[model samples]
Target: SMSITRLFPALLECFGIVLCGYIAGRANVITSTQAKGLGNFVSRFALPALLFKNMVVLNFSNVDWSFLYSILIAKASVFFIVCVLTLLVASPDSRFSKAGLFPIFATQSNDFALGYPIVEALYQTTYPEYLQYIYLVAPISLMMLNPIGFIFCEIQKWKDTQNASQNKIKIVGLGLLRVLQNPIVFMVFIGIAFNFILDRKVPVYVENFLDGLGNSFSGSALFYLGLTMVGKIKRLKKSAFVVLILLITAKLLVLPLLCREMVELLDKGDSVVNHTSLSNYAFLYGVFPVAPGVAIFATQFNMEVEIITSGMVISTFVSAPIMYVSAWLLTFPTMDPKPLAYAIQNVSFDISIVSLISLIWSLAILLLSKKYKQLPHMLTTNLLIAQSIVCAGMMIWNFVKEKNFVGQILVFVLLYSSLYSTYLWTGLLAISLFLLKKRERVQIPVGIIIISGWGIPALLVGVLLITGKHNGDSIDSAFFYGKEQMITTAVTLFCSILIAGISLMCMNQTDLQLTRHVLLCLLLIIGLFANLSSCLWWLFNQEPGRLYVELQFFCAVFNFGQGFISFGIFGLDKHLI
Candidate 1:
């Protein structure tokens, strides 16, 4: 009931992004450029401005430095533990350890992606001001911690690559200079300077642009991610599961408890003299599981992608229930403990009651996957084509309805379509390798996906500069009063360019995949429908009540159809025995 309808598209889109990345990687369609470009765009350009814009406007007069540090330390400790675990995994066998290190490198838990939705949901009943508090902690975690975490991973990745390539590395200062030049970092600091030193507010139009950019982030990000993941499904190594579990542990269970402990200490110290409320809220925010950034970081750095993808999927699916309980636990003593405790207890009861039903479904799917594995892989091009067509129609309907999701979808489709073309060329290159025994030629495509993935997102920032139109209702028109909007836009463009180059040149590529045409199509279609649904809901401002009803009704119909008609139709162990 607390699940607000407005956040559905954003939440759903996150899944789409993960699946798309898998699909693209499975098909071996996305080249290195595409992957790197995606990373660069997301990290440097789109996200920094998104965070800065959100933060500078908030009322931090009651800012709690003590609480912030406590949460930061807690997060930092978790990161340290993860790094140590990664090192242990790697120290045994260098190659195998590097493989293990992949998922940890990939993980980044941005509060924006995870916390915003949860806060929105929680606030549907309790408090609206809590959303602002969530935003405050989120940006700091994003702007400061994100790049810091990424830099550590990049150092490890770069060192490993240099050794493997056996190249005389760059002269000193080059890497530091390069890091300094990053637009996301630069913009974040600049935004900070603007607030602290100059006391300047970003103009109105700039705010509008940021609001639009922020809105674009959730859905488009997810859908293209869908494309990437579906294509990469074949490359999922069994070994990756170990890393997945480890990263999931770090992101969900381990990190949260550490943050909670830190919060308890801070509260006792009276360090939060100014803003006790804000500090308390941040402590709560930090306890939420990692955001979509974990996978994004991996793709950006081109680390162990399969492990990263799996970590994201497993952690997210698991995190929801874990978080629901945690929120209740944290909120209880402060208020009346009974109602919250009862609610959490009821949730446990419900989980037990529903466990058997879900297990049955899971078993059924596992059986299907096993059966399908034995059969010659069916490409399911028809399924893909139909889904694509349906997705297209959905986009059109959203556009006609003037939905933000439609506009955001168009911008991404156009941008990524260009990158996807690079993927097509890579697929062709792979085919050439098989036919002409030109395996060396395969690197060309691989390089392209890595390079472009990081670069494209950045480039999109600029492309939007020339052709991009800001579209959002809740945004302030006055913010764009004049000059600052253009400066912010330019900064975004610069950041994208920087990250793309870094991702292209530095990230690892062991987890990349390539599959036959039919499988690629099937994965792509499933990804498309999933993404398209997210885009429509997000852009159109559809009511959540209606959306939930539709989803439930569809599930019911599907289950009914399967039960009566196709019951035990597929050959199974029971039938064979």
Candidate 2:
């Protein structure tokens, strides 16, 4: 089974990923599908392959299994402590209860969804081994984390059953079965079995396909995550007091400080690279907030999704600044004051500016959210939902507009894989949770909303990018662009969609739903044109064409994170919009 200590890198990456989603949500600039599709890709393909390929290539003879075990145990201990803290500090009547579950359920991270790419990026400098480490632990973490998380869900279900006077409680049995069926587990098993037991490798063509699929999640997933943040910011402040404090401690204080100590202990004081690697990995993993999957866990346990979602977002956003500082601290050397000082000077200055802007934004939003808390809860939820819908349209439009036939196509593929799979996964989960004797009825809609809001549009865009027929010049011109605009066509399309969402928010409430549907229709039409245009443009831009087609495949998986978050948090209330 996967363990938190081993999966820290992935968890850290996931924290950032979800924070980005939250930003997107808050911005009200995208459809929920954009989020879900991205995650699916990582879980189903990229992550598992990263594990299998990386592990097979590494020499693990010198690895300190004992040390790894100690870290894992310590992580588990911290998780339990956090859980206790939540129950004790967060009252049932207080909005903090919702926020409380965020930390508790967030015990594990979606490392595959977020961590791998960042590890690859950061570690590419000296000890490239960090990337391999991320991949190596991914399968193990994937296998382990879900079981531990679900155990909590089972306990919660049992308690809920007893409280509701349901006689036939079967949480223990159902929990075991669900754990066995977890997709992450399935992927891990396949990856491990292929490498160890079967001594297998995917055919080159298939491997190349998977490579593209795996690599594609980084951008799409993060973008959707940003959109989710934009849509959800209003409700984040309800539990701001504890939420912010705990987030700061978890992401900013404890992890980095602990990692510094751990690295010093691990270092031999001889090899500079060894010391650097140890500290870098530790800080990277340590500072990341709890994983995105907490959203799912919270829902499965019938916990308050809003509180968890908000806390997850807050922790993640705050964590970035903490990470920048931590990273700077880690870069400092005891002996070499010159380079260290120079580095600190630069990092500190840059971070100061960025942090100031971020803090101001956070403060501004926090204030507005607090002021609006007096409004009816239903009204708030609806308003958010409406905003999310508009955002979704804008994002889809942006995606379409990004058409260098290749960018458009890749984006489409990314969408299809994520949304279609999420739709299926959520549906199955809804039924399974319902049929499980000890589960909550509310879990079903959580599953549904998660997929519907995020999954629908991601898939829609994927489809448009895949099948629509049209001319590139016309499409590019329509989006207000020149030929060079095609360079960032995918990003541009996404940005345009985001802008549309922002604009729609200025409209009257009665017109809101109608405008949303209209935008959806427009998206559908544009998709049709995009598919055809991409194919036609392929002749002139063959490489881009291939890239376009390739990304279409990957975007779906990246978007899964968004869908999962939405599904996990958005519940049965019609007010959910």
Candidate 3:
């Protein structure tokens, strides 16, 4: 469940802000000058404010220098590899500038703006000290890498006009000075200096000032991100297209894989941090897409500006999916693609088959079966309908594609409500079975069944959507729904295990009863796994990724099969048998 739900909020918070800026920019409201101003404002003040606040107060004693070096050494290694590869492969005059520039983009990431928010959302609670790594990793990249990029940019600036620079020392200082003057780099030291000078007890008013500005970092940075993507995609060319691929592939795929290798090698030394969790974090961080500054040197030096900006736009969109897949793949101790494809193919096949079976039998039981008029059949039919809706939505979601905002939200809420409703109805069906066994004393009304089964799920999602409209941006519908689903699935499945299993044990043996009891028992286990498979994966968090991904695959298959299985358990009439 931690893995299932956390990515969406980061996607929502980030892509949400970027999306709004796209609307404003594509809508032609925000001018380039204004967008640039907002961006500079974020760089100059807000991000610095945030960095200063976090760095100022962090307990340096808790910092894991091993993990810290792992990330840096990993990052620097990627830089050099990319640098060598760019020079070796590109047989063009442009390789001089690209040699340095490629590595900067390859190695640098949008960690401060995009990756930090994600790591904050995902790890801050678990890791608690995650901010220190970002604060440490980023400023070093700014100093070491940015200065490298600017040198090549300056070379390109000179080589283009065929001017041999007489004042070489002054120009080299220009790049280093540029790096030195960067507010992000500057704030790292200033925050440290003031922290030591102020005896590590930051002034209260100063803290308030930093907090006030730092809060603005979230909104401004994302808005600037959105605005940047607006016209970038519209600007492209033949060679530029390949260059975009080269840039993105280097940033997203190559760097992350290399980072994993570096981490694996260096990770053998220290035993302080959890190796598995830290490896996942380092690789995922490496996959955070290129820095926003990747476009900056290109734009200033007039070196393939359009291509780099376009790469930035596309890279942001591409990174989220890759982020998820990399996490999923890393669960495997080693990577193989053949079975991975089969696993994906198998999930779709299972879901499609289950949807059809669920729909057909639920319809038949509702319309054709005479037992459907009664209380138990009624509750069972409702569960069938809920299962039918959810499985079919899985089929529908198979066709869902990129950038359709309306469709995405609609699919999210619909699947969310129906999934919860299915869990609620399952619990109620267990209650009805229990009541039937305890019949003489426990005559309960159907109203309670209808309201509790349907009404409660409706209320949960209804309140979220209503509050979503009024509360606006306070939180996403994503943040808490998984928690609800996790609890609901556990509680309802508990009822099925406790009540249904025990109730079935009390029944007299018919030839049909023998098979039904076994079938029903198997159903409970499948239902438990199917519903809670996402959370179940996390249960083996310390174990290998196979058993982690293993349960989920079977879960999707069996959960999808529940409806067909339902026809046997709920729809079968022993008298006919």
TM-score, per-candidate, Cα-based: 0.48, 0.51, 0.59
Q: Write the per-residue lDDT of candidate 1 for residues 1-577, one digit (tens) a residue.
A: 1332233344344444655565565456776567667756665556676667755665567555566667767766765666565666565434433433343333345455556665666564544555665555544544544444444455555666566542324422433444455544556566666666535466776778888776765555554444433323233544565556666766676666666677777645543432344433444464454454456546656765566665555555455445544454444344443343233333333333233233344345535555333211111211122223222332343233334655544544443333222222223322322322223332334345444544553454355445645543311111111233333333332343343333322322310222332233222233324333433443345454534333322222221122111112221112221
| lDDT of candidate model 2 versus the reference | 0.45
TM-score between model 3 and native:
0.59
Location of the lowest summed lDDT over 10 successive residues in candidate 1: 563-572
Tens-digit lDDT string for candidate 3 (226-246): 888765665355576667788
TM-score rank, highest first? 3, 2, 1
Best by lDDT: 3
Candidate 1 TM-score, true structure as reference: 0.48
Candidate 2 TM-score versus the reference: 0.51
Quantify all predictions' global Cα lDDT against the true fold: 0.44, 0.45, 0.66
lDDT tens digits, residues 217-293, model 2? 66655655555454443433425545656654664456445545645664445366665556566666656555555
